[PDB]
Design a protein around this ligand. Structure first.
Ligand SMILES: Nc1ncnc2c1ncn2[C@@H]1O[C@H](COP(=O)(O)OP(=O)(O)O)[C@@H](O)[C@H]1O
Ligand SMILES: Nc1ncnc2c1ncn2[C@@H]1O[C@H](COP(=O)(O)OP(=O)(O)O)[C@@H](O)[C@H]1O
Ligand SMILES: Nc1ncnc2c1ncn2[C@@H]1O[C@H](COP(=O)(O)OP(=O)(O)O)[C@@H](O)[C@H]1O
Ligand SMILES: Nc1ncnc2c1ncn2[C@@H]1O[C@H](COP(=O)(O)OP(=O)(O)O)[C@@H](O)[C@H]1O
Lengths: 408, 408, 408, 408
C-alpha cells in the first residue's frame, strides 16, 4: 500500500525509535518489497515471497517497537506471539494456527473500528435528518427545484444551527423505532441507527482476509527459546516441535479462520531472539531458509537513554508533561534533570538486572509519584524537575540495591 | 469516568481500608490517569498506556480489598485471578485469555444488572397503565387535550391508589398474554415484558465491551509464585511460561470473547505478591517493564486490628450489630472488648499461622457463636460485649494452640 | 488428467529443479500411472493403487521442490506434513486424519480460487450490462431482431468505450442493491454479485473432494524420524505408533472432512527422509509395502549451485533482477560473480552446518542487502554484480565462522 | 445377504488369495452363519452372535486381504483399525467408538456411491428429456394415444439419435434453472439435477445403520500388541486398557453415530496378530470368549510367491501388462522370468527383513522402472521380461544388502 521509499520508512521510524538504524533498514526493505512485488507480472508474483527477518539483540532495545511502528506505519494487521507459548501443547495448549486466527481477529477489530471513522460523518449528516424531520415534518411530497428542500434552510437552517447543542426535547421517530423518546437519546439512538446501513458484511469481513494475506506482520518473540540447548533432550523435540509447527506458516499454507480461508504465503515474519544460549544456526534448516534477513540490535547506552526520554514523538517525558497539564500544572524538565533520570536507569540495570529502556518507565514513574498525586492541589504552578529534584527522589532508592529489586 | 482527584480517591478508599496509604496513593494515581488520558489529543491517547501496579506485601493486609474498592469506586469491571492457576496448563489448563473472557462475563452480568435499575422504575410505571387499562378501559379514541386523558386521574386515581397495596385481584390482559391471570401476577408478568422491550439488546452487550476495554481492572494474585526459584528447573519453564503467556495481555492485544472482540491495551493491571522467595526483579524483563509502579504494604498491627474492627463502613462489628438487630437484640461492643478481640486475633497469628486480618473474622465469629444462636430468644434485650465476655469466650481457645489450628 | 508422457513430465520439472533426474523419473512414472489407470477397465481400476514413493537424500537438495512442482504441474492438491508432528499425540496431538482434512481445505481454497478465474471475465462482462442499463435504460420491451438491441452499440458503445477508464461517476442500481453508490463502486459491488450467482455452490465443494480423491498428493516429510532407533524404547512405541496411525491413510480408508467424506485409496504419497540414523527397512512392514518406489537424491555440488542460481525459471537471480527493475535499476550478474556466490554458499555449508541449497538464498540476500536498500536512489543505473563486488561483500563474513552461524 | 455356501465362498476367495485355505474356511463359516441366523426364529436370533475370529500369522501373508475380499464379497461395510492406535488415549487419542463411527462413515460413503450407480440411468433416460423439450417444445397439452408422445419419435427420435455426441448448442431450461447455458453444461447441469429427486434421506442414511448392524466387518490389526508383555507394567494396563475399551464393541453395545444409533451386537470381528511375543491366552478372559475362532496362517514360500505374481485376478503382473498396454506396449513375462522375480523377493526378505508378499510389489516395481519410463517411446513393441532381463535389473541390488534396505 505505502509508496514510501526505504529511506522515507526509516525516517518515519526515526520518529519513534532511537538508534538501531540497521534493524530499521532491514524492516524498511521488507516493506518496500511488498510494493516492489505488486509492480511485477503474474508469474513472479507467486514466486517472490516475503524476505522474513530475524532480529538479534538484548531485551527492551527496540525489537518489538520497531516492528510495531513498521506495522502501524503501513496500516498492516499486526500480531505478537511468544514462541514458548507453544512448547507446552505437547501436553496441550494453543495450536500455532491461532497466530493466523488472532492476526485475523485483530485484523478485523481493525477494519471494523476503522469503519466507524469513515462512517462517523454519515450518521451526522445524511442521518441527523431524522430529528429535523420530526421538528419540521417535510411538505406533503416535496415540490422539486433542487433548492426547494434547500429553501427552509431558514426554517430548516434554524433547526440545524440551534441543534449545535440545544436539545433534551423529547419527540419521536421510526423495526425502525416509532417508540417515543428523548434527543439526548432519539438523536443518539440515530448515531448508530443510520450507519449500519452503509457498512456491509461480505466485504468488511472479506477484506480482513485480504489484509492479513497481503500486509500481515507476525512478530515471533523469543524464537531462540525454541532452539536446541545442551541441557536435555526430551524438551528439545518439544522446542524443535514448535519450530516444525511454525514451519507451515512461514513456508506457505492455509489456515481456517471463522472469517474465511487465510493464505500465509505473503505474511511477513519478524522473529526475535537474544541468542545468548543458542545461535540462529541452531534453528532448523527449513526455518533458517525462511529467515533470510539477519539484523543485530545494540544494547542501549546512557546517551540512548537520554534521547529516548525526550526525542520520540509522545515520549514518556512529553506524555508526563501532557498529563500534568491536564491537572493544570506546568511540568518542565531541565537537560541535567533528564541526564540524571537516564543515569539512574542505567545504574539500576547495571547494579541489578538489565531490562533495557523499560527501566526508564519505572524510574521516571517513581520520580513523579509525588507530583502525580498532588497535581490537583498545585494547579496554576510551574514545577521544574531538575537534577536536584531528580537526586532527592531517586538517589536513596537506586543506591539501595535490594530495594531496587522491589521498588525500581 | 470519575472526576475525583487522586486525594479524593484515597479518601473514599479510607472508608474501607485501614492504613496502607502508599498503596492507596498508587492505585489512585492509576485511576486519575484514565481521566488524564481522555483529556489528551488523538495521538497521545494511543501512546499513553495504563501504569500497572505491583503490590508487594504479606497475606491479608489489604491488597485485594484496595483493588476491589477501587473498581467498585469507578463502577469498573473487576476480575481476580490466581496466577498459579495457569501453571498446570503446561499439562492442560485454562488459557490465559480466559482472564479477559471472565472479565467480560462478569462485566456483562454487571452492565446487565445495572440495566434492571433504570428499568425498574419506568419499567413498572408503564407496567401499571397495563393493569389499569383493564380496570378502566380508556375511551374509544382518547381526546387530545393532554389532560382530558388524565381526567380519571379520578376513577383512574382510585385504582392506582388502591393498587399501592390492595391488589392480588384476578384479571386478564395481553405473543402478549391474552391469558386470564391474577393482578398480583399480571403485575409480575408485566414487570418483565415492559422492562425487556425497554432494553436495547445490542448496545447492552456492546457496552460491557466498552467497559472492559476502558475501565477493566485485572488483579493477578500471587504473581510472585510464577517467578524463577533455585529449587528445580522444569517448573521454572512453565512458571516463566505463564509470564510469557500473560505478556500479550498486559502489553496490548486482542482476545475473543463470546460477546465480542475485546482489546486489552487499556485494562489496568494490579499484580500482587508476597515476594519472600522471589523478588520483583525475578519477573521476566518484558513484565517488569509493564509494572512501572511498585508499592509495598506493611503488616497489620494490633491498632490496625482494633480499627479494622469498627472503623470501616459496614465493618464486621457494625454488621454483627445490624444482624442482631434483625432479631431485636441490641448488641454493643465496649472499647476494651474490641481491644481484646483484636488482641486475641494477633495472638493466634503469632502463635500459629499469620493469616493477617482474615483472623479477625474467625475470632469474631467464634466469639458470637453463642449470641448468634440465642438471638431470637433474646429479643428486646441489651446484650453488651465487653472485655469480660470476650475473655470468657476466647481465652481458653486462644491459649490452646492445637485447638486454634482447628477452631480459630 | 495430464496426458504428458513420463519423459515430458521430467522435462517440465527440469525447468525448476537442477539434477536429481532419478527422482524426477520416479515422480513422473507416478503421475503417468494415474492416467494409465483411467485407461483400464472397471475391475482393474479398483485394484491398481498409487505407487507411493520414498525419497531418500540429504537436506535441501530438491525433494519437496520436485513434489511441489509435480502437483503444481497436475493442478493437484498438495499438502506437506512433518511426520514428527504426530509424535506428541501420544500425550495430545493433531490426529493423523488432519492430513486429509487439510489436504481438503487447501484443495478447497484451490478449486474456489480457480473459480474466480472463469468468473472474472463473464463476471464483469454481464456486470457491465448492469451499469449500462442505468446509463441508457433499454427500450420498453426490446425488439427481438438480435441486432435491434445491439443498436446502441452506438449510444451504448460510447458508454462502454468511456467505461474503459473514465468512470468513478456516481449512480444507482439494484436483496439486490437499490442504493445510490458511485459507478466505481456499483462496478465493484457488481463484480461480486454477478460472479457469485455464476458459481455452483454444491459442485464447487463436491469438486474439491473429487480432486483430493483423484489427484491428491501428500508429502510426509522426515518419515525417517519416526522409525525405531537404538537409543530408547518409550519413544519408539509412539514413533512406530505414528506409523500405525498413518497406515490406514496409505492403505486405503475413509476420513471425515467438514466439506464431505473423503477416501484416500488414490492419494499419491511421497514420503521423505535423510536416513542416516534409520534405514527404510526400519519402517513397519505394512508401510514398506505401501512405498514400492525408492529413489535417492544426491547431494548438491557447486556446479549444481551455480546452475540453481540462474538456470531455473524465475530463479532467485532472475527474481532479484526483476525486483530491482521495479526500482528502475538494471542488475546484471557476471559468470564469475555467480561462480563466487555459489562458491561462498558451499563454503559456509562445509565450514558450518550443511543446509543444502537453502544456503544460496541467505548468501544471495546478504550480498544484495546493499543494493536492495539504495535501489530507489539508484534508479536509471546499470549496477553490475561481478566477482569483485561479490568478494567485497561476502568474503569477510564467510571467512568468519561464528559470524556465519548468525549472519548467513 | 449372500446365499453362497462356505465352499463357494472359499472358491470365490481363491480368486484373490494364494493358499491360506484354513483362514479361508474360517472366514467362510462366519459369512454363512450370518445367513444361517436369519433363517431362525425370534428368540434364537438374539442369542446367536457372530463367531468372531482371531487370525494368527506373520506379516503380509494374507490376513487383511482375506478379510478385505470377504467383506467385498458380501458387499459388507469394512473397516480396518490398528489396535495400538488407542494405547495413547490414556494421554489422549481416538476413543474406540470411532471404529463404529468410521465403519459408518465409509458404510455410508458406500450406500451413497452405490446410489449413483443405480441412479445413473435415471438421469440419462427419464431426465435427458430436459434438453429434448427445449429442442421440440411439446404440443400445447399432448393429445393422448399412449403412442402420441411416441409419435415424434421421428421428429423426436431424430433429436435423440443426433444427441449421441453432437451438442455444444446453447439453449436453456428450468429453483429449477431458467438461466441461459450450454449443453456441454445444460445437459450436465441435468446429470445431477434430475437424480436427487429419486434419492431420499431417511432411507439411504437409515440403511447404512442397517448395513453396519447386519453385515459390518471390523478388522482389528495387531491385537497382540495390546496384550501383556513382561518388560514393564505401566504400559500394560494401558494396553489391557484398550482390551477393556474394545470389550463393549464385541460383547454388544450401542454407539452414537451422527447418522443414528448403531448396535454392535452382530458386527463380525476379525482380530489379527503375529503372536511372537504374546499368545492369544494373554488376551483378557472376556475377549478370548468373544474370539471363539482361532486360525493360523502360514508364511509364504517361493512357490507361493510365484503363484501370487500371476494367478490372482488382476495380479500385480497382470496389472503391469495392462498399464503398459495403455502406452501401446506389449509386455510379456516368461515362466522363468517370474520364478526369478519371486526368487529375488525371497532373497531380500531372508537377507534383511521379512515383509511377506509386500516385497514382491517393490521388487516388481524396481524391475520395471525403466520400461515404465520409456513406455511411451516404445509403442508398438513386444517387450519380453525373461530370466535374463530380470537378472540384469535386480541381481546387483538384491546382492547388495545395505542397498536393499534402501532401494528394495
Ligand atoms: N531504541 C529504542 N527507542 C525508543 N524506545 C525504545 C527503544 N528500545 C526500547 N524502547 C522502549 O522500551 C520498551 C521495550 O520494548 P521493545 O522496544 O519492544 O523491545 P524488546 O522487543 O527488545 O523488548 C518499549 O516500550 C519502548 O518504548
Ligand atoms: N488494611 C485493611 N483494612 C480493612 N480490611 C482489611 C485490611 N487488610 C485486610 N482486611 C480484611 O481482610 C481480608 C483479607 O483480604 P485482602 O484484604 O484481600 O488482602 P490480601 O489480598 O492480602 O489477602 C479482606 O476481606 C478485608 O476485609
Ligand atoms: N535441485 C534443486 N533445484 C532447484 N532448487 C533446489 C534444488 N535443491 C534445493 N533447491 C532450493 O532449496 C530449497 C530447499 O527445499 P527443497 O527443495 O524442498 O528440499 P528439501 O525437501 O530436501 O529440503 C527449495 O526452496 C529450492 O528452491
Ligand atoms: N496369500 C496371499 N495371496 C495373495 N496376495 C497376498 C497374500 N499374502 C499377502 N499378499 C499381498 O501382500 C499384501 C500384504 O497385506 P495382507 O495381504 O493384508 O496381509 P497382512 O494383513 O498380514 O499384512 C497385500 O496387498 C496382498 O496383495
Amino acid at each position: 500500500h505505502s509508496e514510501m521509499t526505504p529511506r522515507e520508512i526509516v525516517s518515519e521510524l526515526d520518529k519513534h525509535i532511537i538508534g538501531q538504524d540497521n534493524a530499521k533498514r532491514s524492516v524498511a526493505i521488507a516493506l518496500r518489497n511488498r510494493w516492489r512485488r505488486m509492480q511485477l507480472n503474474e508469474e513472479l508474483r507467486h514466486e517472490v515471497t516475503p524476505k522474513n527477518i530475524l532480529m538479534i539483540g538484548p531485551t527492551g532495545v527496540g525489537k518489538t517497537e520497531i516492528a510495531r511502528r513498521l506495522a502501524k506505519l503501513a496500516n498492516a494487521p499486526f500480531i505478537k506471539v511468544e514462541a514458548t507459548k507453544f512448547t507446552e501443547v505437547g501436553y496441550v495448549g494453543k495450536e500455532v494456527d491461532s497466530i493466523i486466527r488472532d492476526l485475523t481477529d485483530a485484523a478485523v477489530k481493525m477494519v471494523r473500528v476503522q469503519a466507524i471513522e469513515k462512517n462517523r460523518y454519515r450518521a451526522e449528516e445524511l442521518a441527523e435528518e431524522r430529528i429535523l424531520d420530526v421538528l419540521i415534518p417535510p411538505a406533503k411530497n416535496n415540490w422539486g427545484q433542487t433548492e426547494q428542500q434547500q429553501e427552509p434552510s431558514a426554517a430548516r437552517q434554524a433547526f440545524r444551527k440551534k441543534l449545535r447543542e440545544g436539545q433534551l426535547d423529547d419527540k419521536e421517530i421510526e423495526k425502525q423505532k416509532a417508540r417515543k423518546l428523548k434527543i439526548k437519546d432519539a438523536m443518539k439512538l440515530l448515531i448508530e441507527e443510520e450507519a449500519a446501513k452503509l457498512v456491509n458484511p461480505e466485504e468488511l469481513k472479506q477484506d480482513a482476509i485480504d489484509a492479513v494475506e497481503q500486509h500481515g506482520i507476525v512478530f515471533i518473540d523469543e524464537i531462540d527459546k525454541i532452539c536446541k540447548r545442551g541441557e536435555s533432550s526430551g524438551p528439545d523435540v518439544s522446542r524443535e516441535g514448535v519450530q516444525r509447527d511454525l514451519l507451515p506458516l512461514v513456508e506457505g499454507c492455509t489456515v481456517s479462520t471463522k472469517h474465511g480461508m487465510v493464505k500465509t504465503d505473503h505474511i511477513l515474519f519478524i522473529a526475535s531472539g537474544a541468542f545468548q544460549i543458542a545461535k540462529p544456526s541452531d534453528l532448523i534448516p527449513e526455518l533458517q531458509g525462511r529467515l533470510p534477513i539477519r539484523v543485530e540490535l545494540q544494547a542501549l547506552t546512557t546517551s540512548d537513554f537520554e534521547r529516548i526520554l525526550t526525542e520520540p514523538n509522545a515520549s514518556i517525558t512529553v506524555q508526563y508533561k501532557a498529563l500534568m497539564a491536564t491537572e493544570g500544572v506546568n511540568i518542565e524538565f531541565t537537560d541535567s534533570g533528564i541526564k540524571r533520570i537516564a543515569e539512574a536507569a542505567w545504574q539500576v540495570n547495571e547494579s541489578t538486572e538489565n531490562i533495557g529502556a523499560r527501566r526508564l518507565h519505572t524510574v521516571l514513574e517513581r520520580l513523579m509519584e509525588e507530583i502525580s498525586y498532588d497535581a490537583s492541589d498545585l494547579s496554576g504552578q510551574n514545577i521544574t524537575i531538575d537534577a536536584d529534584y531528580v537526586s532527592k527522589h531517586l538517589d536513596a532508592l537506586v543506591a539501595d540495591e535490594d530495594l531496587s529489586r522491589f521498588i525500581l
